[PDB]
């Protein structure tokens, strides 16, 4: 009776693979080559030749285990608090275990979705007082070594300027040999409202959404382009490929909320329960994510 996380719509089925771990790290190794100098012309006798160098890079993904505690009514004490149509103490905000666990799990899944989208953990509207996390723990928005474009405050309404920034970012993208892949765009409701205006005298049957889809298809080898609206974002536009070879999600198999075996019973009617969940596991290649920020200040 718990709704599926909304983060599933941001990934392809092949882009997600579970890992059996609660807290710790995983690591992978990649091998690269480079040219140290111009080639050597083979003429007459020569012993000193230009060299080709090699390199190894080890990428680590960290995982973190977190817990929450909630109060509820004791199973034996339920019958003294139920009623004809309302269950639980309305005055004291006490609920049965099932309802309390359902609501708490929903809240935790919302928190997990926010972390996966933005790479931060906070409960303030300002976004401050963030929980300090481990290195190598990033989301789709705070991933380093990506393409970042910023539209100025004065052009917060100019869709032409927004599209110019998006086009510059798309040009700076480096999909490379993995270009023949579907693409995913995530926008805020204000941007979605802006995208339906006619393209600019105004055109006929040509809208900014169609123009953006054509521009992205120009680089994705005319593959599918998907657009999603997320109220979690605000003045942000996110563009990235749905290719496992570039972006992958290896979450813990215990990432989603799970009840604990410990229950804090007492002489009274109030009991306490615990829920565990795991955070971390986003792997991304560099210069494959475009993030556009619309400033207001």
């Amino acid at each position: 009776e718990v709704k599926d996380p909304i983060m599933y719509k941001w990934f392809s089925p092949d882009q997600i693979e579970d890992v059996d771990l609660q807290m710790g790290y995983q690591k992978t190794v990649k091998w690269d080559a480079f040219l140290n100098a111009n080639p050597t012309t083979i003429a007459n006798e020569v012993n000193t030749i230009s060299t080709i160098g090699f390199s190894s890079e080890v990428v680590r993904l960290n995982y973190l285990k977190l817990q929450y505690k909630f109060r509820h009514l004791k199973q034996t004490s339920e019958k003294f608090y139920t009623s004809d149509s309302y269950i639980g103490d309305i005055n004291n905000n006490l609920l049965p275990f099932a309802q309390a666990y359902k609501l708490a799990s929903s809240e935790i899944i919302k928190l997990i979705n926010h972390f996966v989208l933005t790479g931060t953990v906070s409960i303030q509207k300002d976004g401050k007082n963030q929980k300090r996390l481990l290195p190598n723990m990033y989301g789709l928005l705070n991933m380093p070594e990506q393409i970042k474009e910023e539209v100025a405050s004065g052009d917060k309404d100019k869709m032409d300027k927004i599209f110019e920034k998006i086009e510059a970012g798309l040009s700076k993208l480096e999909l490379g040999d993995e270009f023949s892949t579907p693409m995913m765009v995530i926008v805020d409701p204000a941007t979605s409202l802006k995208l339906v205006k006619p393209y600019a005298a105004a055109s006929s049957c040509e809208k900014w959404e169609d123009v953006l889809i054509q521009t992205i298809k120009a680089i994705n080898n005319r593959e599918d382009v998907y657009i999603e609206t997320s109220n979690l974002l605000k003045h942000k536009i996110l563009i990235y490929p749905l290719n496992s070879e570039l972006i992958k999600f290896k979450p813990s198999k215990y990432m989603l909320p799970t009840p604990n075996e410990q229950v804090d019973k007492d002489s009274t009617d109030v009991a306490h329960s615990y829920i565990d969940f795991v955070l971390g596991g986003l792997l991304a290649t560099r210069k494959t994510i475009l993030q556009v920020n619309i400033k207001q200040s």
Binding site: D4, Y8, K9, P13, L256, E261
Partner: peptide, 29 residues
């Protein structure tokens, strides 16, 4: 029927995985 709490947790994780697979099967963009 889960004999112990470890089996219960494994069943919960398998249920989450199956729900994810079913959601992707039923997804149509």
């Amino acid at each position: 029927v889960p004999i112990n709490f470890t089996e219960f947790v494994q069943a919960i994780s398998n249920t989450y995985k199956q729900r994810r697979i079913q959601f992707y099967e039923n997804l149509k963009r």
